[PDB]
Design a binder for this molecule. Structure first.
Ligand SMILES: CC(=O)N[C@@H]1[C@@H](O)[C@H](O[C@@H]2O[C@H](CO)[C@H](O)[C@H](O[C@]3(C(=O)O)C[C@H](O)[C@@H](NC(C)=O)[C@H]([C@H](O)[C@H](O)CO)O3)[C@H]2O)[C@@H](CO)O[C@H]1O
Ligand SMILES: CC(=O)N[C@@H]1[C@@H](O)[C@H](O[C@@H]2O[C@H](CO)[C@H](O)[C@H](O[C@]3(C(=O)O)C[C@H](O)[C@@H](NC(C)=O)[C@H]([C@H](O)[C@H](O)CO)O3)[C@H]2O)[C@@H](CO)O[C@H]1O
Ligand SMILES: CC(=O)N[C@@H]1[C@@H](O)[C@H](O[C@@H]2O[C@H](CO)[C@H](O)[C@H](O[C@]3(C(=O)O)C[C@H](O)[C@@H](NC(C)=O)[C@H]([C@H](O)[C@H](O)CO)O3)[C@H]2O)[C@@H](CO)O[C@H]1O
Ligand SMILES: *[C@@H]1O[C@H](CO)[C@@H](O)[C@H](O)[C@H]1NC(C)=O
Ligand SMILES: *[C@@H]1O[C@H](CO)[C@@H](O)[C@H](O)[C@H]1NC(C)=O
Ligand SMILES: *[C@@H]1O[C@H](CO)[C@@H](O)[C@H](O)[C@H]1NC(C)=O
Lengths: 321, 164, 164, 164, 321, 321
């Protein structure tokens, strides 16, 4: 006699999924939606290569650390890679005011172009060619930060300086300068005759008056003296005004922000592989159609969503045996 | 199995049914074979694919993860930033996992339900003219050619027949 | 349809049933008409209204949105504040949408289930004394006045009757 | 009741069934008693215990609550810290409550479903050889000793029997 | 032969809902729970009208910018509306210390009452009637901030000032003052004979000593000079103590915080419509029983919960056709 | 005739649960997963007792407030309990720089050991035994902070001080010092002959130069003078350098961080009960296997997860009647 039967599909698959009431349930079909693999390389981001400071920090880079001469002229970048602990930072001991706040600014910038706003040759009445230290040796000879100039007295006299710069450009200007804190009064006099010195700086919004802090401190890189660096963002048509009778580490090169936009600063020990990606993590790039991943939180580019899970599988097929 | 169908009163699946998820196995005077129920299977595929894409579309606005720096005397807001991004990470991971589990269950009970519903679609067609073997098959009281089989498949089963 | 009832083996809804959600259509010697099943409908309305109010009550403690100002050198915590309120916004929006979808499904399968359960309430009352037409109707083997109809409606169906 | 079983067509529960959750009540020539269905009950217990532990395991990575101090001129980030920890508190409380409600429903409909499925396991064993009383009992057309009862319990019911 | 049938309700509705597996599902009944409409007006909040600074900022308002004379005497308000970019802020260039932190304080205050704590007539040994600038013109003549007074020398001499105020009131006092940073020493001498000046300020908890910062800066509103304003909240029975030999922009009017409570500061370009609401957004007020809305995050009052969605409909009825 | 019946379990339980569609549903079995009970005592945390400052703050404790002599020598602790409003804080009026930031440091420290790094006897050319005030009375006689020493002139002369300390230890050192702000010049001269004083402090990273702020202020604890305290964390082998010609409140005792680790600072009015727990809240300890609780957010130890709910019950059994 004839008959007819109702049933369902089975097959040869071992893909398991998990439910709320039952774990490791075997099914005919299943879909992984979790990307768990990277290339272990820092790649180009949409064709444009990131600026990777090697053992350089942002401070060392921008101030023109000699040991960072690899980056004297940096082209347009996608993101910025800094190591966790850059060996080359402030070769001469001291500080960088609102450093983190500047690093944050870098996240919205894709290209500086360095330009000489104050030529080293222009200091007729001072010494601009003796501003060196053994704390910043370049090729085994005492050197210093390139982007700024460490003025000292000339012919036993440090006259008051009234130097200014009008940003005639149509671009914003990152301008950097500094102050030298000596470790005794004798040194203060030795470098800049005037015992009681200062540096006044003014713009449209800026109105500050630094004075050096003579104090006894320990040796960092063989020096008990300190350098403290300050910065600002000069608007187009705005001008910056310096007046000082000593301890003034003057600007020389400044950076034109000629290309803004969504960028980032990565912390990574990895170096540049010769690749290209649409999604980059500090521990490797991703090429996947997967909607999720579990590689790293800090992600840049056209990327899947990060998730802490070790395993996420969605059930497409039915119950098998 | 929520509805008793899959791995219940229907004890197993058909390795020989490869033309879809659901279907029928016929064994008459014109041969024996597996056929796949088109529209139900399709509606199921629609359900689950639309489900996957729904889940994805529900998680395009997640949480990013920008990095922030803080100095030696900004330990507090550094801790806050850490604790808060880690927090969001926990909540979105939770959301994805939990949603996945729930919808896995919903999916299995969905297939179960589809099997049940098919079984009833055929059962309500063959009132007296067939017997419940119990294992998910209907045995014919009359001889049923491939065309009656098809009429049952596409739902056009002409009931007007004897049975004893 | 999860249970096969709505838009399944019962192919359509009654435009003529306006006294509630569920009910019966009778056609006997004392006229033809639609009646609405009181207690089941009521329990359903209770279910879904209590559901809506439940969903609302589950979202009275959401997230506010106070505005905060930060200067030209407080870009970081400004970014943090933004990213975090935007974050919470994303998570609560997600929660509301997802909950809504889920409970929409639960609602439809809930109505489906109620229809199924009614159909079985009547089917178990009329064992042999009625035939399954298949489309969601029970045909009487005996003549059934409006009082038998009501006895089936309120559940007080006196079974003691012949059928051939 | 989603499936009509619990508090539906089976109007009540058995106080006398104490050896588990589900089972049978037999009344034959060798006495009357309640037996508990082993494997179904067990699979249910597995389901719900694994469910509880699943819910717990889904909330081991919640949100902590470290305290932070802020001065008389740090009112803003103090407010932010407060608003954000309070925020997370709200979201995780929401998650726990909502998950609990949902899975309570899923649990009740799960038990309902298990009862339904058992009722069908026995119904499909006793095709003609028993009658549906309607209230969840099957009446025997033949005399059935404790061994037939057991054969129905463990599923080994020898059908080959008369009925009139 | 008689028969009986089981069925379900259908009707003439087109309301669609969405589920996890199926979108745009048509149903017999449905309930929108998302409020998507506003009035486009800033209304009273529970009967009490908000303080809407027109093109004034909080700085310009509280310091008594002449161009803000519209708000010399402000009554109790519900919330505060400031534009994104108020044109009238610091008419004379400079800064406001912890400005944002004060704005935050305003969120817990519903009413100041201005009171003269130092009469302009009391400066016998100084000039208090020549503290004007063209950077703050009122009606085409050089003016200045009203709530404070710009003292300058009298008869070629600026004697040291020892002025104090004991808050005898039972209310907290917002007290404001300032310092003038000149742009050259000649100006410093011209206005306040003493070359080396300062302003010391003390309370129970306050202990600060301002000194002016002479520096070359660019012109904002035609002036290269700067004003820097400071504030504090004087407790009842507490006293504030000023000692200064120059550059002192003294308080004159102070604000009694006579009504605290849950308030807010809104940013909005909208102006006052003549309405009333229990819920207010920066882009319009809301009158709804709806539990959700998608108008604006920053909401004040008795309001529904904001959500990013464009559409949220909950299914009340069953499947229709 | 024989028969067989299908049914389900019922029993004698009244435990209710709640679902999405139906509230207060009675069931046969149910499981509370919400811990709602505490002991109302502050207990040991895993056997090790917390440091509970009574009416002392961290400032008063660490600076060596006399009224805090209860804590001159504090052993290893688990967590730290401070009251909301400690009565004994800065007995002599003034401030504590980055106080909150130090309290945060305490969260990663389980034990200081106080050591004399500068003996009071070593000040040959100054007075170190007259640095007292009635603002800090100990036993009804004018006293002062124990951990630091208030130097004043000797034989009508306050010579410049050049005191230094090399951390020869292998542990980090919390070093505290201060500056005295007098209320008039006559007092400044009276205590430290030199009219224009300062305190320079240097380490490897530290480079600061404090100057006193003479100003007229109100009386707190009978004094119009102020003390401002500063701190730093000295690395092993690093040294700290002090140079000062006045107003210098010198260090004497410093704290060796000899045991780091996950700790915390609790705010609680509760005092020490003699108990032990694996989980501690500011309002009581918890002993439960429950996964949730609704006692307090700020929780320390091996604890359940806090939740705002008043009631959470999970349904284990089925529907009963
Ligand atoms: C045996 C003997 O007497 N040896 C001396 C030797 O001490 C001395 O070396 C100088 O030591 C001083 C401090 O005592 C400085 O550290 C000098 O080093 C540097 C540096 O290299 O950077 C030197 C540098 O030339 C200086 N540059 C200028 C413009 O002054 C800086 C600068 O002063 C520091 O940054 C100051 O804080 O100091 C180091 O030369 C030498 C030379 O004096 O003579 C030996 O006889
Ligand atoms: C052709 C010619 O020589 N023209 C001068 C003209 O320069 C001069 O105008 C004065 O210019 C000075 C700076 O050089 C100031 O900018 C003066 O403007 C203001 C102001 O209006 O606010 C003037 C104001 O009267 C000043 N108030 C006081 C108390 O001094 C302030 C104040 O000094 C500034 O804020 C300083 O930073 O300056 C402006 O008058 C006039 C008058 O000197 O003489 C012409 O001959
Ligand atoms: C009737 C009469 O003339 N009475 C005086 C009485 O004023 C005076 O008491 C002194 O008052 C001065 C201020 O005027 C100080 O307040 C002194 O109090 C303290 C203190 O107890 O802490 C005194 C303390 O001895 C001082 N210690 C040192 C090292 O100077 C400190 C310290 O100066 C303050 O911290 C300064 O800001 O002041 C209080 O003695 C007495 C004694 O002068 O003479 C009566 O005749
Ligand atoms: C810079 O130069 C432009 C014209 O070249 C001038 O208008 C502007 O005032 C100058 N900037 C300043 C701040 O003086
Ligand atoms: C202000 O006056 C009251 C009495 O009127 C007095 O007790 C208080 O000390 C005074 N305030 C100050 C800080 O001197
Ligand atoms: C402290 O002493 C050690 C040797 O004992 C020395 O190496 C180190 O330089 C000293 N510290 C400083 C900062 O001088």
């Amino acid at each position: 006699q004839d008959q007819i039967c109702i049933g369902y599909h089975a097959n040869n698959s071992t893909e398991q999924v998990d439910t709320i009431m039952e774990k490791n349930v075997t099914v005919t079909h299943a879909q992984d939606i979790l990307e768990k693999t990277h290339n272990g390389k820092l790649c180009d981001l949409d064709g444009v290569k990131p600026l990777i400071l090697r053992d350089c920090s942002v401070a060392g880079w921008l101030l023109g650390n000699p040991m960072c001469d690899e980056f004297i002229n940096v082209p347009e970048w996608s993101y910025i890679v800094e190591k966790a602990n850059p060996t080359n930072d402030l070769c001469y001991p001291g500080s960088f005011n609102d450093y983190e706040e500047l690093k944050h600014l870098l996240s919205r910038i894709n290209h500086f172009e360095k330009i000489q706003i104050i030529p080293k040759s222009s200091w007729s009445d001072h010494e601009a060619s003796s501003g060196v230290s053994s704390a910043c040796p370049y090729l085994g000879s005492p050197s210093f930060f390139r982007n700024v100039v460490w003025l000292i007295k000339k012919n036993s006299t440090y006259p008051t300086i009234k130097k200014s710069y009008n940003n005639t450009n149509q671009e914003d200007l990152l301008v950097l300068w500094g102050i030298h804190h000596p470790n005794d009064a004798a040194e203060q006099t030795r470098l800049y005759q005037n015992p009681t010195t200062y540096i006044s700086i003014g713009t449209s919004t800026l109105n500050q008056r630094l004075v050096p802090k003579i104090a006894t401190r320990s040796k960092v890189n063989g020096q008990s003296g300190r350098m403290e660096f300050f910065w600002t963002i000069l608007k187009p048509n705005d001008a910056i005004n310096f007046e000082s009778n000593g301890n003034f580490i003057a600007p020389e090169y400044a950076y034109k922000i000629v290309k803004k936009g969504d960028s980032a600063i990565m912390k990574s020990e990895l170096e540049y592989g010769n690749c290209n990606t649409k999604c980059q993590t500090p521990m490797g790039a991703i090429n996947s159609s997967m909607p999720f991943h579990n590689i790293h939180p800090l992600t840049i580019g056209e990327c899947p969503k990060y998730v802490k899970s070790n395993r996420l599988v969605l059930a497409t097929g039915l119950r098998n045996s | 199995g929520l509805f008793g169908a899959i791995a219940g009163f229907i004890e197993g699946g058909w390795q020989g049914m490869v033309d879809g998820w659901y279907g029928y196995h016929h064994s008459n005077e014109q041969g024996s074979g597996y056929a796949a129920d088109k529209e139900s299977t399709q509606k199921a595929i629609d359900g689950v694919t639309n489900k996957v894409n729904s889940i994805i579309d529900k998680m395009n606005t997640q949480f990013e993860a920008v990095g922030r720096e803080f100095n030696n005397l900004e330990r507090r807001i550094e801790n806050l930033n850490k604790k808060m991004e880690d927090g969001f990470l926990d909540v979105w991971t939770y959301n994805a996992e939990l949603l996945v589990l729930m919808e896995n269950e919903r999916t299995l009970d969905f297939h179960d339900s589809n099997v049940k519903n098919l079984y009833d679609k055929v059962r309500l067609q063959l009132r007296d003219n067939a017997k419940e073997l119990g294992n998910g098959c209907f045995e014919f009281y009359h001889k049923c050619d491939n065309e009656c089989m098809e009429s049952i498949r596409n739902g056009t089963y002409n009931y007007p027949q004897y049975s004893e």
